[PDB]
Each structure stands twice: as C-alpha cells, then as structure tokens.
Amino acid sequence: TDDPRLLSLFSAQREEDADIVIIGFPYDEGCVRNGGRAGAKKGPAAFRFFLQRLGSVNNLELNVDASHLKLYDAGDITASTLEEAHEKLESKVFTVLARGAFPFVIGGGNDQSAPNGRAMLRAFPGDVGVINVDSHLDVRGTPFRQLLEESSFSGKRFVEFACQGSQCGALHAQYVRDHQGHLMWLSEVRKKGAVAALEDAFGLTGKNTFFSFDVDSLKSSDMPGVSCPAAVGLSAQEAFDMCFLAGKTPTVMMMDMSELNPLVEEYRSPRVAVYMFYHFVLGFATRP
C-alpha cells in the first residue's frame, strides 16, 4: 500500500532466513501468583492481532528504514504439561540462538524467562548477561532465582531495572546483591533518563545480553492490561525508547516480553506491546 508496516517484513519463507523470530508462550504463570489476575496466556494472540496492523517499516521521525529485515512467526510453544512447555520453549529459543538468528518471545507470564535464560546459558557458555525490566523483584516459579542459581551465570552481570521499593522484599534485594547483582530502582532510572540508565545497564550486562521486559514495569495509565497493574512506572515513550536502544545494541542477543494480559485490558495495552517490539525492530535495523 502507501504505508507498508510490520506485516510486510514477514517475507521470509523459511524461519532459517528470518533475522528475527517470534515465539509465542501462551501460559499464565508469573505475577498471577503474586496477586495478579489470570489472562497472560492470551497475550500472544492479542500481540499477534496488532502485529498484523501496526508499525511503519520506514519511520521518518526516527529516520530508520527497517524494510530490509525479515521477520518470521514460529508460532506458539504448546505442550501437554507445563514443565514440558518450558522444555520446548528453551529448546526452541536455543536453536534460533545457535544459528545466529534473534529470538523474541511473547508471553505469557514471567516464568517463560527461566527457559529463555537457560537457552542463553547454553548458547554462550559462561558469557551471558541478563537484564530484568520489572517493577517487581521476586526471587524466592521465580524465573531469576533460577538463573542466579546457575553455575555458569555470573551475577555481576545481572540487573534489576526499574524495580519499585514499595514492591520489593528486603530479603529479595539482599539475595540479588549478595549475588553481586545490581538494583536500578525506578526513581534512579527516571533520575538519569531511561535510555541513559539502560545504557548503564548494558555496560553491566555486557556480552550476550538477554533483554527481558516485564510490561507491568510501565505505569498502568499507559499500560493497564497486565496481570499486576503498576501505579507508577515507565511511560510508554520510555518503553519505546528503551526497546529502540536494545535493538541497536549488538550485544543484545534475545528479548522476551512478559505479563501482557488482555483480560485486564484488551485494546490499548496490546498496541503498546506491539509498538515496543516495533521500536526494537527499528533499532535492530541499524546494527551492522
């Protein structure tokens, strides 16, 4: 048309030919445990709905043309049991990783991040960095406890980003810091500027960074459709700006997006999620 969008980049016939591969994880488990509501398993469908509709491939405001990228939608990870779904998720992300392609996993609840991280720890033995963008710091199932408990993974390369002190147990903080992980509280992200704060974060995570974006880290005024709606947090613009940085940052080797919940809110929030991926995609179009 007069206005080619994200849909037009899905010209890769074989997954092996796509620069970026989208994987769905339609399962609830995550913040629904810590008070949140059911429904995150519907996130992948809602994301896909707007995926077919949004995001000009040539953005003249940012002046980035992503027309050259190929996207592929590998579908949903489905399994008879939950732990098996975890296994098939990890195995799938790893394969995409192993061949040099970029995996983006749309969820689904926080718990997908554990499989995703292990896929990383296999793909880059001992040289993985991880950032959790999340208003929550829950590490008592608790995906980042699992990763901190990994032999291969160095905690000096783990950042909790935009976490909120009103929602973070002190034992939880203690654990991360005792593992030499870094807490970057919302107030400080906001103090520095989100993108600048996130630059700092990639300095800490370094090579082979897993960019994990819990969307309940955004304020519910912009992002109400999540299992654990946030009173304060990142604005939609900050989110976009951060996704663009991640995309242009060549050490960022995969991304997941957690907690999208269309039962909580079904129109505005899925648009934000697609626009976040969109900005990532634009950023990606700029790397060598």
Residues annotated within the binding site for Mn(2+) are 110, 134, 136, 138, 214, 216
Residue span binding its own copies (CB under 8 A) among the ranges 11-19, 22-30, 105-113, 265-273: 265-273
Residue span binding its own copies (CB under 8 A) among the ranges 70-78, 100-108, 119-127, 269-277: 269-277
Question: What CA–CA distance (Å, rounded) separates 31 from 40?
Answer: 9
Interruption sites in the chain after residues (C→N beyond 2.5 Å):
140
Binding of its own copies at residue 38 (CB under 8 A)?
no
Angle between helical axes of 82-98 and 113-123 (0-180°, round to 10): 40
The pair of three-digit structure tokens given for residue 159, joined into one six-digit string: 């950042």
Numbered residues of the known binding site:
110, 134, 136, 138, 214, 216
Question: What CA–CA distance (Å, rounded) separates 215 from 273?
Answer: 8
Please tell me the count of residues contacting its own copies according to CB under 8 A.
48
Among 38, 82, 98, 231, binds its own copies (CB under 8 A): 231
Among 19, 29, 90, 216, binds Mn ion (CB under 5 A): 216
Binding of Mn ion at residue 134 (CB under 5 A)?
yes
Residue span binding Mn ion (CB under 5 A) among the ranges 69-77, 136-144, 146-154, 263-271: 136-144
- CA nearest 236: which of 273, 278, 267? 273
Report, in Å, the least distance between residue 200 CB and its own copies: 17
* Contact track, its own copies, 148-187, x by CB under 8 A: ---------------xxxxxxxxxxx---------x-xxx
> At residue 25, what is the residue type?
F
Report, in Å, the least distance between residue 114 CB and its own copies: 19
Angle between helical axes of 194-205 and 236-248 (0-180°, round to 10): 40
Report, in Å, the least distance between residue 30 CB and its own copies: 16
CB-CB contact of 66 with 14 (8 Å)? no
End-to-end CA distance of the chain: 29
Among 275, 277, 280, 284, binds its own copies (CB under 8 A): 275
Indicate which of its own copies, Mn ion, none lies near residue 7 (CB less than 5 to 8 Å, by partner kind): none
Question: What CA–CA distance (Å, rounded) separates 90 from 286?
Answer: 28
Q: For residues 135 and 209, which CB has a smaller minimum distance to Mn ion in the complex?
A: 135
Bond into 108 cis (ω within 30):
yes
- Report strand pairing: 64-65 vs 58-59: antiparallel
| Helix ranges (DSSP H) in 10-81 | 43-51
Angle between helical axes of 236-248 and 268-284 (0-180°, round to 10): 30
Beta-carbon contacts of 265 under 8 Å, excluding residues fewer than 6 positions away, are: 224, 225
Among 19, 32, 106, 110, binds Mn ion (CB under 5 A): 110
* Contact track, its own copies, 54-83, x by CB under 8 A: xxx-xxxxx---------------------
The pair of three-digit structure tokens given for residue 207, joined into one six-digit string: 């090579």
Indicate which of its own copies, Mn ion, none lies near residue 81 (CB less than 5 to 8 Å, by partner kind): none
* Per-residue DSSP letter, 99: T
Interface residue list for Mn ion (CB under 5 A): 110, 134, 136, 214, 216
Interface residue list for its own copies (CB under 8 A): 1-4, 35, 53-56, 58-62, 140, 163-173, 183, 185-187, 219-222, 224, 229, 231-232, 236-237, 240, 267-268, 271-272, 275, 278-279
